Amino acid sequence: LKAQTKTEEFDAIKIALASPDMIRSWSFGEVKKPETINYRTFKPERDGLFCARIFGPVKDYECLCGKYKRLKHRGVICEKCGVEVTQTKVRRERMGHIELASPTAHIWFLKSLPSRIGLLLDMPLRDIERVLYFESYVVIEGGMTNLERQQILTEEQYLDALEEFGDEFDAKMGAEAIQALLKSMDLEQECEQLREELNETNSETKRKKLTKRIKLLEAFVQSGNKPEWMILTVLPVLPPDLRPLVPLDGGRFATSDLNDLYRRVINRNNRLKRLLDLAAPDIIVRNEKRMLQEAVDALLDNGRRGRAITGSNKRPLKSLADMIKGKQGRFRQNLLGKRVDYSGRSVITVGPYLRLHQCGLPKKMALELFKPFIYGKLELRGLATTIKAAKKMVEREEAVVWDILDEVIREHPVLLNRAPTLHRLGIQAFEPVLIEGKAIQLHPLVCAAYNADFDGDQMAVHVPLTLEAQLEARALMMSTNNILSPANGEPIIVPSQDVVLGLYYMTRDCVNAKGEGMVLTGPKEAERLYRSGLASLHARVKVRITEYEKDANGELVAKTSLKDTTVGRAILWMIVPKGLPYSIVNQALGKKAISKMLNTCYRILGLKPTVIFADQIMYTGFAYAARSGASVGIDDMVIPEKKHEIISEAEAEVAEIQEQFQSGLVTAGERYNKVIDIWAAANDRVSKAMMDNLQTETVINRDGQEEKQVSFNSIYMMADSGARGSAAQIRQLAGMRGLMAKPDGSIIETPITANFREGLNVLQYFISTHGARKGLADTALKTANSGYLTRRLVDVAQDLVVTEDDCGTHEGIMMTPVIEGGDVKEPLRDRVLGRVTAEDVLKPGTADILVPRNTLLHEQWCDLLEENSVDAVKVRSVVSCDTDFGVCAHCYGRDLARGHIINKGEAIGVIAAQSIGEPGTQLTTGGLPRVADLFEARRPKEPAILAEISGIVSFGKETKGKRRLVITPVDGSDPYEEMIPKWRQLNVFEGERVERGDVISDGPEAPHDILRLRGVHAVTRYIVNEVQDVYRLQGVKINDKHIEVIVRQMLRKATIVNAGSSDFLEGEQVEYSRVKIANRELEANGKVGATYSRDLLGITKASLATESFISAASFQETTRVLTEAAVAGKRDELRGLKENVIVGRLIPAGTGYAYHQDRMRRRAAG
């Protein structure tokens, strides 16, 4: 078969240096003139930056001169002025060139930090630049006389040496010099010689640089790049429409800055050719060559020399490098964003009538958005003759079009998105419901996922177009299909505020109320008792209920009974579906309980019942909260009667200690601590006064004189239910508020005695103001820090995707309850839930396997483990996965919005990064910066040091700035000796044995140490436990999984120790390496297999290494990446997410995982 020549669907991409002949291959003509357009007739001046002949026709299928105007003549080259008449679009495509007079350095390869021309020649940068500027002479191929090959000479020196040796010696200067150097260079010979020199001399200094350079050279040879190409003989010109002259209003013109630059280049070039033909003196033509160099540099990348300025405008002109780089840090237009058709946005409102699967979409918006569908559906049914008439109709908004819109809307989902998109739930698919209004209506239960208030936040709509997009939106991005946070299995659909105040008010009980003590047949006549005004919503009552238990085999058992409950609970029970026990609704129904109701319902009945359940819960919560008549008055906030007395006594203490400071019994600072302590104690007392009084003070009589229960006061119910408010804010309302602190952080010893229910005076308010402003500032800052962090995270993860099914390794980490210092800061059940078992586990007695090797532990399995006393389970993790270049689903876990095991092909790196990132706004060394420090693996300020090796140790030498520690292993050799500065107080016992990784001092320790001296499981455990300490201290739920995948990405690279295939000390992929030593253990060499050492790379560091260069050019410094890749002739195969996002094809994950896989196997095959 003939493979192909012309257009196919391409794979990979290649980048390298460009030959002059190559640059010519692209060029369809040489632009010889600085002229742009004719100045009256605006036609392009022929062979100029804007040209019809070289580039293309000005208007569609029309010759410039005007002779051939017909769409027939096409491949015709006009005789008058040759222009092939073709679409004007080809003026957006065709390149050009300029043949420079003198050679020119390409500023990218001269000024890139590791100067390419420089280190290829082993020639220092400043020397090379000194040569290019004609500031000195440099030797080339010196032969055998007096002189080194790379040696530089001055005027007089060159003269003398020339007088001595006429021939068999050579020296040039300028660009031609460097080009001659590069051309003369033989890489292979240098290779041989350097291998030898590497071998002969033993010094670290010598062979380090030696090996680095030889590797560099041989890489450059293998590239296919010849050094000469770093010096430009020919300069390509960019297509005109990519740097347009296009006219504006007022007859004014506007053009790209590349025109000024290209113009300058052409000018000085032609003038140089002229100066050559005029036989000018050296001092002139040299100046001209230099100026040409500067012009070219300014064109390519401006700012590495002089930063030339555009005509009449101070602001420096944008060069091609600046064209590529973009702005806003690193953003390549697939990054910062891209404008998109079929979209819209507006202010959002509530819409409680909605089912959770839908959203209100404004009429006009739907019309405009679905306009093309409407056009097609209108003439398909034949209501409109032609598409034109269809437009006329929808523009007239004729009566018949609304029905057609209702047709095209029905099964067609739409995507809704909010401004701060963090986790994947930031975008959710809904079924559109036509609404009269300009506002978008969004289901209340979703408001938590978007973090969307109703205070004027806006949402954007996007219309999924292709069939695949509709089905993706419906089966993936659909609201009902994500009920659970991907971070943790807990429901994100949890009722928010009004609803929970409703369910809370519903099931609650007062002491005495209408219908107290009576009995009812069932929930029906309970509700009937309530709605008729006979019985009160909350009263202690026995009613018969019928509950169910699915506890049979897949089967629902029925049981009936007389339960002691209230009227409200009885009414509410009507909603609860099937197999749930009445136990769940018989409580007070707080936010937590009202959430666990949903959770249990989902882990029992399945998805659909849970969906409709949540819906009904919302409806009833709203309705009954509305009926309840909850409100807030000024008298709802109750101040303690004892407040003033507490204030007075605590105010007596301060005058006590003040008297002592006057008499000098106590020091000023000690005094300060004392007074601050008494005032703090005061605040605690007032708070714990107002809390008792607010909470229990309802004193009410049933048939006797008195009884007291939890208060029915509004603000209390609100704070208690979890609807809104909290003990702190309520404390600020009634009790006194806090003690403030100056910006310094020195806490003021005269606290705010007054509260918000009372007035604050001038000073108090002024002092509160700082707290406010710093609050807004800090929060608004932590948003940015969160974003930056997530960014680093997806950058370090991204392409990690579930790929294989099961690697099948027994490997994994030991999962224990966290058990910190007190009782159980987090159980075992949460840590092991949804995680696969590495191996079978035991009862206290054995040959009884409860959980059999690798099995997803769901709620039932975890409860079965809980029945038994088992404290310990070994669990497979993403960090331990044997699979290379990805994670097997069997290792990951089940976690998702769905309880089933993770699908094959879902991209986990991204969702992990997101899951870690989203809560980051809620985090307060400790803190979010501590989190960053952890993920960056930064060695702390005052780190500890761990024993290098086990065995008895002792102290040696003296006081040089380090008092040396000598370790003595039992069997093995002693010589390990570390230099410990003695000015730091030690721990380690001079007479005792210390295990490797023991405490030889105090303070935090760098995870590099934990990785080396303790090992991979130990280091991953340290990272996960510390970061989880940070999050969990703030009340943030994040599964260990995501952190573990980030960790896996951190340790991706490692350094080799032994040899037999590749180089000694190289940092490299443990995927590559392990797949190589697994392959080397058999066949090949019988075993030559090398030993490596696992390395720890920070997230920002590990992100640096990416196979794909297109990917790297996105988030890294673009200018460097492009060069560094171009010299190696690096070939990007795509294969990742970011790269395929940039190039604009299907993501090698998700739905596209079926595509890229089917193509991946076709590649490197028959």
Q: Nearer to Mg ion by C-beta: 459 or 639?
A: 459
Contact between 780 and Mg ion per CB under 5 A: no
Nearer to Zn ion, 428 or 803 (CB): 803
> Left if phi > 0, otherwise alpha if psi is -120 to 50, otherwise beta: which for 118?
alpha
The distance of closest approach from Cβ of residue 21 to Zn ion in the complex, given in angstroms and rounded to an integer, is: 30
Only segment of 393-401, 455-463, 828-836, 1102-1110 that touches Mg ion (CB under 5 A): 455-463
In degrees to the nearest 10, what's the CA dihedral of 837, 839, 842, 848? 110
User: Does the annotation place 78 within a ligand binding site?
Assistant: yes
d(CA 171, CA 140): 6
Element (H, E) at 638: none
Task: Give the Cα separation of 702 and 511 in Å (integer).
Answer: 6
Residue 776 binds which entry of another protein, Mg ion, Zn ion, none, with Cβ cut-offs from 5 to 8 Å by kind? none
CB of 1070 to Zn ion, least distance (A): 14
Residue from 200, 282, 453, 564 in contact with Mg ion (CB under 5 A)? 453
Q: In 103-250, which ranges are continuous DSSP H helix?
A: 107-111, 116-120, 125-132, 155-164, 175-184, 187-200, 204-223
758-765 LR contacts (CB < 8 Å, sep 24+): 758/639
For Zn ion, the binding residue among 232, 580, 881, 1027 (CB under 5 A) is 881
Q: Which does 373 bind (CB under 5 to 8 A by kind): Mg ion, another protein, Zn ion, none?
A: another protein
Q: Which does 67 bind (CB under 5 to 8 A by kind): Zn ion, Mg ion, another protein, none?
A: Zn ion
Q: What is the pairing mode between strands 358-362 and 427-435?
A: parallel
Q: How far apart are CA 560 and CA 550, in angstroms?
A: 14
Q: How far apart are CA 1030 and CA 628, in angstroms?
A: 40
Q: Which stretch binds Mg ion (CB under 5 A): 212-220, 447-455, 888-896, 945-953?
A: 447-455
What residues does 235 pair with on adjacent strands? 98
Contact at 8 Å (CB) between 464 and 472? yes
Size of the site for Mg ion (CB under 5 A): 2
Shortest Cβ distance from residue 117 to another protein (Å)? 12
Contact 736, 753 (CB under 8 A): yes
Work out how close the CB of 343 gets to another protein at its nearest, in angstroms, rounded to a whole number.
4
Task: Answer with the entry of another protein, Mg ion, Zn ion, none that 63 interacts with (C-beta below 5 to 8 A by kind).
Answer: Zn ion
> Toward another protein, which CB reaches closer, 119 or 754?
119
- Rounded distance between C-alpha atoms, residue 829 and residue 473, angstroms: 34
CB of 348 to Mg ion, least distance (A): 11
Residue 359 is assigned to a ligand binding site: no
Least distance from Mg ion to the Cβ atom of residue 106, Å:
51
- Rounded Cα–Cα distance for residues 1001 and 934 (Å): 21
Q: Is the dihedral of CA 119, 123, 128, 131 positive or negative?
A: negative
Annotated ligand binding at 297? The verdict is no
Q: What is the DSSP letter of 1137?
A: H
Q: How far is the CB of 274 from another protein (least distance, A)?
A: 18
- Angle at CA of residue 372, ends 370 and 378, nearest 5°: 95
**Residue 344, contacted partner among Mg ion, another protein, Zn ion, none, CB below 5-8 A by kind:** another protein
Q: How far is the CB of 1100 from another protein (least distance, A)?
A: 17
Which C-beta is closer to Mg ion: that of 8 or that of 455?
455
Q: Please give, one letter per residue, the 3-state secondary structure of 1066-1096.
A: CEEEHHHHHHHHHHHCCCCCCCCCCCEEECC
Chain positions 52 to 81 lying near Zn ion, rule: CB under 5 A, are: 63, 65, 67, 78, 80-81
Contact partner at residue 246 from Mg ion, Zn ion, another protein, none, CB < 5 to 8 Å by partner kind: another protein
C-beta of residue 137 within 8 angstroms of C-beta of residue 158: yes
Does residue 601 have a known ligand-binding role? no
CB of 91 to another protein, least distance (A): 11
In this complex, which beta carbon is closest to another protein, that of residue 286 or of residue 1094?
286
Q: Which residue sits closest to Mg ion, CB atoms considered? A: 453
CA-wise closest residue to 491 among 618, 388, 588, 405:
618
Q: Which of Zn ion, another protein, Mg ion, none has residue 237 at its interface (CB below 5 to 8 Å by kind)?
A: another protein
| Cβ at position 445, least distance to Mg ion in Å | 18
How far apart are the C-alpha atoms of 288 and 285, rounded to whole Å?
A: 5
Q: Find out whether 51 is annotated in a ligand binding site.
A: no
Give the sheet arrangement for strand 27-30, strand by strand: 27-30, 95-105, 231-237
Q: Which is nearer to Zn ion, 627 or 1094 (CB)?
A: 1094
Find the shortest distance in angstroms from Cβ 50 to Zn ion.
Answer: 16
Q: Which of another protein, Zn ion, Mg ion, none does residue 80 bind to, with CB < 5 to 8 Å depending on kind?
A: Zn ion
Cβ distance to another protein smaller for residue 219 or 323:
323
| Side chain identity at residue 379, one-letter code | E
Least distance in Å: CB of 809 to another protein? Answer: 23
Q: Which does 232 bind (CB under 5 to 8 A by kind): Mg ion, Zn ion, another protein, none?
A: another protein
* Partner that binds at residue 986, options Zn ion, another protein, Mg ion, none, CB closer than 5 to 8 Å by kind: none
Q: How far, CA to CA in Å, does 389 sit from each of 15, 379, 394, 491?
A: 51, 9, 9, 50
Site for Zn ion in 888-927 (CB under 5 A): 888, 891
Nearest to another protein of 628, 868 (CB atom): 628
C-beta closer to another protein: residue 368 or 398:
368
Identify what 191 binds: Mg ion, Zn ion, another protein, none; CB under 5 to 8 Å per kind: none
Neighbours of 968 (CB within 10 A): 15
191 among annotated binding-site residues: no
- The residues pairing with 433 across neighbouring beta strands, listed in sequence order, are 360
Q: Which lies closer to another protein via its Cβ, residue 617 or residue 815? A: 617
Q: How far is the CB of 172 from another protein (least distance, A)?
A: 18
Residue from 585, 552, 829 nearest 598 by CA? 585
How far apart (Å, rounded) are the C-alpha atoms in residues 663 and 447? 61
Q: Would you say 65 or 824 has its CB closer to Zn ion?
A: 65
Q: Which does 752 bind (CB under 5 to 8 A by kind): Zn ion, Mg ion, another protein, none?
A: none
Determine the Cα–Cα distance for residues 617 and 363; give it in Å rounded to an integer: 29
Give break positions in the chain: residue before each, C–N beyond 2.5 Å. Answer: 924
Nearer to Zn ion, 260 or 895 (CB): 895
Number of residues that bind Zn ion (CB under 5 A): 11
- Pair of tokens at residue 72: 């027939």
Residue type at 475 in one-letter notation: A
CA angle 80-84-90, nearest 5°? Answer: 135
Q: Which is nearer to another protein, 433 or 980 (CB)?
A: 433
List the single partner that 807 binds among another protein, Mg ion, Zn ion, none, CB under 5 to 8 Å by kind.
Zn ion
CB 835 within 8 A of CB 824: no
Q: Which of 675/881 has CB closer to Zn ion?
A: 881
Least Å from the CB of residue 761 to another protein: 27
DSSP code string of 691-745: HHHHHH-EEE-SSSS-EEES---HHHHHHHHTSS--HHHHHHHSS-----B-TT-
N-to-C CA span, the chain: 13
Could you say which of Zn ion, another protein, Mg ion, none residue 65 binds, taking C-beta under 5 to 8 angstroms by partner kind?
Zn ion
Binding site for Mg ion (CB under 5 A): 453, 455
Binding site for Zn ion (CB under 5 A): 63, 65, 67, 78, 80-81, 807, 881, 883, 888, 891
Q: Which parts are annotated binding residues for Mg(2+)?
A: 453, 455, 457
Q: Which parts are annotated binding residues for Zn(2+)?
A: 63, 65, 78, 81, 807, 881, 888, 891
Q: Which parts are annotated binding residues?
A: 63, 65, 78, 81, 453, 455, 457, 807, 881, 888, 891
